[PDB]
Amino acid sequence: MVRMHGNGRGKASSALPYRRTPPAWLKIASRNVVKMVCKSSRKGMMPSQIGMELRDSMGIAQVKNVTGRKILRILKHNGLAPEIPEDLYFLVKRATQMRKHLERHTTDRDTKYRLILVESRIHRLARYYKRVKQLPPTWKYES
Amino acid sequence: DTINAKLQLVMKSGKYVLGTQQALTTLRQGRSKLVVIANNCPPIRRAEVEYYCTLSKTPIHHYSGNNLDLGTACGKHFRTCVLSVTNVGDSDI
Amino acid sequence: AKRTVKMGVMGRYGTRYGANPRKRAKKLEVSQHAKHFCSFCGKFAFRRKAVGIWRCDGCSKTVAGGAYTLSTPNNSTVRSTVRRLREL
RNA sequence: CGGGUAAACGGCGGGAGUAACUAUGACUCUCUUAAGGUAGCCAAAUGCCUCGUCUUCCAAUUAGAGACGCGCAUGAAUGGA
RNA sequence: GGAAGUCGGCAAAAUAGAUGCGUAAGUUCGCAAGAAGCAUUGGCUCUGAGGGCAAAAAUUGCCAACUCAGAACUGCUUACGGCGGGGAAUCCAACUGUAUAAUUAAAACAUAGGUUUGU
RNA sequence: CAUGGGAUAACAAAGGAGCUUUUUAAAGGUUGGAGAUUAUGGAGCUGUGCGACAAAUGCUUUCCCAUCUCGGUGUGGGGUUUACGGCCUCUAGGAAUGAAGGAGGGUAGUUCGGGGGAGAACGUACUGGGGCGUCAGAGGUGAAAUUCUUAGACCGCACCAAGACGAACUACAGCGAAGGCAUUCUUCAAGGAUACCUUCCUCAAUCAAGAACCAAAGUGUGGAGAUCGAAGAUGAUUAGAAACCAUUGUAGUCCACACUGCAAACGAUGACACCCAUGAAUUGGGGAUAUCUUCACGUUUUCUGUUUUUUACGCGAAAGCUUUGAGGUUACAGUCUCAGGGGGGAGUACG
RNA sequence: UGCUGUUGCUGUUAAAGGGUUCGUAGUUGAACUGUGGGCU
RNA sequence: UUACUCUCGCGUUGUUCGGAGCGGGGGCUCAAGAUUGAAAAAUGCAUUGUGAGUUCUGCGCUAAAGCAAAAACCUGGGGU
Numbered sequence: 001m002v003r004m005h006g007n008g009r010g011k012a013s014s015a016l017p018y019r020r021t022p023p024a025w026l027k028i029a030s031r032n033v034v035k036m037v038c039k040s041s042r043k044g045m046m047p048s049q050i051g052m053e054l055r056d057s058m059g060i061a062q063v064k065n066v067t068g069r070k071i072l073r074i075l076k077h078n079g080l081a082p083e084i085p086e087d088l089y090f091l092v093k094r095a096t097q098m099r100k101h102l103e104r105h106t107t108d109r110d111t112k113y114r115l116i117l118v119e120s121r122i123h124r125l126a127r128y129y130k131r132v133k134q135l136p137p138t139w140k141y142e143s
Numbered sequence: 144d145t146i147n148a149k150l151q152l153v154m155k156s157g158k159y160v161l162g163t164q165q166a167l168t169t170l171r172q173g174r175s176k177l178v179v180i181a182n183n184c185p186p187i188r189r190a191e192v193e194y195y196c197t198l199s200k201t202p203i204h205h206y207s208g209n210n211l212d213l214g215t216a217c218g219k220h221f222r223t224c225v226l227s228v229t230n231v232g233d234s235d236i
Numbered sequence: 237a238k239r240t241v242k243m244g245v246m247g248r249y250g251t252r253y254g255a256n257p258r259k260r261a262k263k264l265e266v267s268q269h270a271k272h273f274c275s276f277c278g279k280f281a282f283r284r285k286a287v288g289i290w291r292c293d294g295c296s297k298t299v300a301g302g303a304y305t306l307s308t309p310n311n312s313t314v315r316s317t318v319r320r321l322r323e324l
Numbered sequence: 325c326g327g328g329u330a331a332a333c334g335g336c337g338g339g340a341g342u343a344a345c346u347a348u349g350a351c352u353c354u355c356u357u358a359a360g361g362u363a364g365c366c367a368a369a370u371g372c373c374u375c376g377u378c379u380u381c382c383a384a385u386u387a388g389a390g391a392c393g394c395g396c397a398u399g400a401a402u403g404g405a
Numbered sequence: 406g407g408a409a410g411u412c413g414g415c416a417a418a419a420u421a422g423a424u425g426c427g428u429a430a431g432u433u434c435g436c437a438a439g440a441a442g443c444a445u446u447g448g449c450u451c452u453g454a455g456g457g458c459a460a461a462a463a464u465u466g467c468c469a470a471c472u473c474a475g476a477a478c479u480g481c482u483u484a485c486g487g488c489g490g491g492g493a494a495u496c497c498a499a500c501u502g503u504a505u506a507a508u509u510a511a512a513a514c515a516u517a518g519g520u521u522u523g524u
Numbered sequence: 525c526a527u528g529g530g531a532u533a534a535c536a537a538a539g540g541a542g543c544u545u546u547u548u549a550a551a552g553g554u555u556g557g558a559g560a561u562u563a564u565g566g567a568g569c570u571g572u573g574c575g576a577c578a579a580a581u582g583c584u585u586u587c588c589c590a591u592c593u594c595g596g597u598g599u600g601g602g603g604u605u606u607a608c609g610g611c612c613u614c615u616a617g618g619a620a621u622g623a624a625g626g627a628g629g630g631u632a633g634u635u636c637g638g639g640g641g642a643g644a645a646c647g648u649a650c651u652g653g654g655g656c657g658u659c660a661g662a663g664g665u666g667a668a669a670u671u672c673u674u675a676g677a678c679c680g681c682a683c684c685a686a687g688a689c690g691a692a693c694u695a696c697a698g699c700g701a702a703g704g705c706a707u708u709c710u711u712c713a714a715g716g717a718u719a720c721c722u723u724c725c726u727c728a729a730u731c732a733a734g735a736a737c738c739a740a741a742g743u744g745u746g747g748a749g750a751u752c753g754a755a756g757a758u759g760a761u762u763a764g765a766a767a768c769c770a771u772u773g774u775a776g777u778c779c780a781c782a783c784u785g786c787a788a789a790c791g792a793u794g795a796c797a798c799c800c801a802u803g804a805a806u807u808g809g810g811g812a813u814a815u816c817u818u819c820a821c822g823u824u825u826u827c828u829g830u831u832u833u834u835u836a837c838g839c840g841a842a843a844g845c846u847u848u849g850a851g852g853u854u855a856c857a858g859u860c861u862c863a864g865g866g867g868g869g870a871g872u873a874c875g
Numbered sequence: 876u877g878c879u880g881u882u883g884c885u886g887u888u889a890a891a892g893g894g895u896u897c898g899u900a901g902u903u904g905a906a907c908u909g910u911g912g913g914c915u
Numbered sequence: 916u917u918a919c920u921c922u923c924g925c926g927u928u929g930u931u932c933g934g935a936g937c938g939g940g941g942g943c944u945c946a947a948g949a950u951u952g953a954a955a956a957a958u959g960c961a962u963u964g965u966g967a968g969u970u971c972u973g974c975g976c977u978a979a980a981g982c983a984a985a986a987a988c989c990u991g992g993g994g995u
């Protein structure tokens with residue numbers, strides 16, 4: 001979004017605290033936190049969205065600091081991880097919508113240029129996931 | 144779209160059936176919970192399906208794409224004109 | 237392997253009728269023998285029978301339009317104009 | 325009477341002077357038309373003089389080919405290459 | 406001996422099937438191309454490959470019709486019929502086609518392509 | 525070739541839920557030597573019980589099934605602890621470096637902007653055309669002439685047609701990878717910045733080969749043809765003028781699809797990363813705390829990202845550059861890549 | 876002859892940054908598992 | 916009929932087919948043949964098995980060229 005494929009140089013991001021201990025006023029047991037994570041997944045939420053629900057309305061700043069494990073690790077233990085990784089899923093969805101737009105507007109050359117960048121990003125990402133065996137070999141992206 | 148998100152939840156968690164003939168069988172029984180029809184449906188076939196839904200008081204949704212789009216939205220590689228979901232699991236609708 | 241470099245279907249003409257006239261006829265020749273998408277049903281099964289006459293293998297439906305293609309570009313504009321005027 | 329139109333029929337120039345050897349004239353005057361043949365091509369199925377001049381082909385070629393061009397009388401849909 | 410004949414290679418001679426290898430300039434990339442050119446071919450006695458139907462059946466029996474390839478031996482007097490000679494260039498017409506029944510088949514006509522006129 | 529050392533590195537593997545020990549008891553399944561036959565036992569194989577000790581993650585667990593003031597401490601005060609029940613199930617399941625002022629993804633203001641595509645309309649102006657009036661000139665230049673005009677030019681008013689183009693506001697301002705991009709409304713897919721105690725965990729930087737885009741002029745096929753205008757025509761000027769000036773005018777200039785791949789395509793300055801003095805501004809987002817209107821604007825101070833300007837070290841042959849380097853270099857080493865080697869012949873010849 | 880430059884050249888104007896991006900070989904690539912202790 | 920889940924399956928010499936319903940089990944129907952008999956031995960003259968050819972038939976039905984019509988007959992919708 002910033003550096004690869006473009007000239008952006010933005011710095012906006014979050015900064016985790018030095019003190020990794022949950023506050024005293026938080027009185028939720030670790031078992032119940034794990035239950036809420038798995039419940040939201042069956043409802044259809046992605047790991048990024050799950051962590052924001054707990055942050056916004058439950059007082060849980062970091063799931064790892066309460067339970068000892070990350071959100072995606074919890075889903076893998078319960079057999080709830082997505083078939084393909086989340087960031088690869090969103091990039092494929094974006095490219096599909098670009099291609100559907102382009103089949104009517106054949107002269108939108110700016111969109112055609114952006115489609116080249118997104119598909120290069122997909123192929124780089126797929127190569128990494130195949131090396132660490134998060135994707136099957138011979139997985140291929142089809143335009 | 145919101146309808147496509149729910150179809151994916153049903154496709155992985157619930158139970159469904161594809162095709163006009165099998166959907167009508169579920170409507171003759173009482174197992175159907177929702178019927179989805181593509182906009183590319185023959186007018187006489189659509190009128191017959193809607194009549195069955197009215198008699199059995201089954202909610203019906205008019206999909207915004209054709210039978211090609213409906214099949215793709217279910218993860219299939221073929222065309223489907225009518226879809227009937229007998230079991231909805233972990234989904235609102 | 238590939239059997240010709242430049243002229244695919246015009247190879248039946250040998251060396252006769254000139255490069256540019258062959259080239260111009262090739263674009264329309266390819267179009268009139270391809271399978272076009274059918275809005276009714278959902279298949280790529282529209283084939284031209286005679287000039288301006290198209291029949292669907294799946295639908296078994298007959299449509300009138302286009303000498304060498306199913307829909308002319310001028311027809312697409314006219315449909316949008318008529319729909320807009322009706323909605324007024 | 326006054327306008328338009330050449331992928332309508334058709335048409336598309338002469339004289340003398342001039343550069344540090346000579347030759348030739350980039351240059352300069354002069355008479356003249358509706359316009360004065362542009363790009364190309366040639367002794368060509370179109371050149372009278374003519375068996376033109378040079379090269380190649382042969383022991384020997386009024387024949388063939390490649391060049392040159394003041395072209396009796398080449399030349400652009402009377403279509404040129 | 407080999408076009409010296411003749412206006413002019415007219416007429417005649419010449420090439421020749423099939424199979425393997427090989428094939429230039431030029432080009433509208435389709436061709437040119439059977440370009441050019443080299444080699445083999447008989448008879449006889451054998452060997453291998455290519456199938457159908459029934460009961461690690463990766464096994465057993467029965468059976469039909471032809472083709473191709475390889476080897477040994479043994480011959481030629483090069484021996485029915487039928488069957489392209491080839492190459493380097495110039496002029497004209499783009500090409501298939503038409504056409505003076507009874508002296509002219511062409512560079513003539515037509516053609517696709519291009520332009521103009523009337524409505 | 526042998527061998528000692530382990531700081532800096534390289535190769536390979538993995539992608540983290542494909543992840544107890546011991547002690548007793550019981551049950552079955554070498555005979556003198558050489559050649560045969562058999563049996564008793566070791567050892568190990570399972571399934572029973574037994575004793576003893578651990579465990580890096582609590583089985584006096586979890587889960588739903590239900591049914592009903594004192595004491596110790598520090599200096600008379602401070603701070604520390606203290607002053608519905610029962611039941612039946614189920615039960616590999618908490619032990620994993622951290623989240624780069626490196627990359628990717630998410631959510632939000634339904635954010636920001638002459639960014640891109642599509643469709644409807646709007647605005648004056650140039651040209652032309654009729655409708656209403658008028659009458660002798662109008663146009664053009666340094667001065668004139670080609671040119672138009674009593675068959676009514678030029679000029680005046682309201683209109684009609686068609687094709688281009690969006691003045692003033694417009695700025696050392698914004699958006700875009702570059703080429704480029706200014707009227708309004710509706711519509712489609714994008715892009716960057718900011719905010720975050722969201723997710724992930726090395727996925728990165730730069731490049732032969734290969735691919736996509738690329739002003740104007742030019743090419744092909746369809747449209748269109750108002751304005752301007754290569755070629756050409758006609759007036760002038762001039763010794764001459766094929767030119768500069770004037771009146772015209774073909775191809776073009778505009779649109780769709782397909783080619784071409786060149787520019788003083790320039791900041792004449794390759795990409796990524798670090799450090800670096802000062803003062804006023806400016807565009808977008810956010811945080812903290814006197815002005816106007818009825819939520820917007822604006823004040824003061826911080827902050828991240830953008831295009832710049834003025835007056836430091838240092839550098840340079842100089843002109844000049846300077847947080848935006850051409851600085852941090854003979855005190856010569858962060859990483860990758862492109863090009864040059866006196867002037868011509870020449871970006872020519874051949875392939 | 877530091878006018879072939881690994882040591883060790885130049886590329887704003889002297890000769891010389893590719894029109895702009897994507898991208899495969901290739902070259903290059905962030906931190907972390909580690910202070911031994913006691914005696915005269 | 917979770918048949919196409921993540922290389923889906925059936926089929927031709929051949930240019931393709933399927934949730935608008937593939938493949939498998941069981942059936943209905945059409946076309947062309949085969950077999951059993953009557954005719955027919957009472958006739959004719961004095962035998963039943965494979966390969967090659969052969970347009971009836973089946974494989975359902977180039978083009979800016981897309982392949983005559985009517986009589987006669989057949990079936991149905993209504994009504995009686």
Ligand SMILES: [K+]
Nearest residue numbers: 623624724725
């Ligand atoms: K990170």
Ligand SMILES: [K+]
Nearest residue numbers: 652653654655
């Ligand atoms: K007027």
Ligand SMILES: [K+]
Nearest residue numbers: 656657658676
């Ligand atoms: K008037």
Ligand SMILES: [K+]
Nearest residue numbers: 807808809810
């Ligand atoms: K602000």
Ligand SMILES: [K+]
Nearest residue numbers: 807808809827
């Ligand atoms: K600000």
Ligand SMILES: [Mg+2]
Nearest residue numbers: 361362364399
């Ligand atoms: Mg001439």
Ligand SMILES: [Mg+2]
Nearest residue numbers: 366367371395
């Ligand atoms: Mg001549």
Ligand SMILES: [Mg+2]
Nearest residue numbers: 382385387388
């Ligand atoms: Mg001779």
Ligand SMILES: [Mg+2]
Nearest residue numbers: 367368389390
């Ligand atoms: Mg000659």
Ligand SMILES: [Mg+2]
Nearest residue numbers: 330331400403
């Ligand atoms: Mg002419």
Ligand SMILES: [Mg+2]
Nearest residue numbers: 370398399402
């Ligand atoms: Mg002539």
Ligand SMILES: [Mg+2]
Nearest residue numbers: 406407408419
């Ligand atoms: Mg001889």
Ligand SMILES: [Mg+2]
Nearest residue numbers: 408409410411
């Ligand atoms: Mg003689």
Ligand SMILES: [Mg+2]
Nearest residue numbers: 414415416417
């Ligand atoms: Mg002869």
Ligand SMILES: [Mg+2]
Nearest residue numbers: 429430431437
């Ligand atoms: Mg060749």
Ligand SMILES: [Mg+2]
Nearest residue numbers: 439440441442
């Ligand atoms: Mg031969």
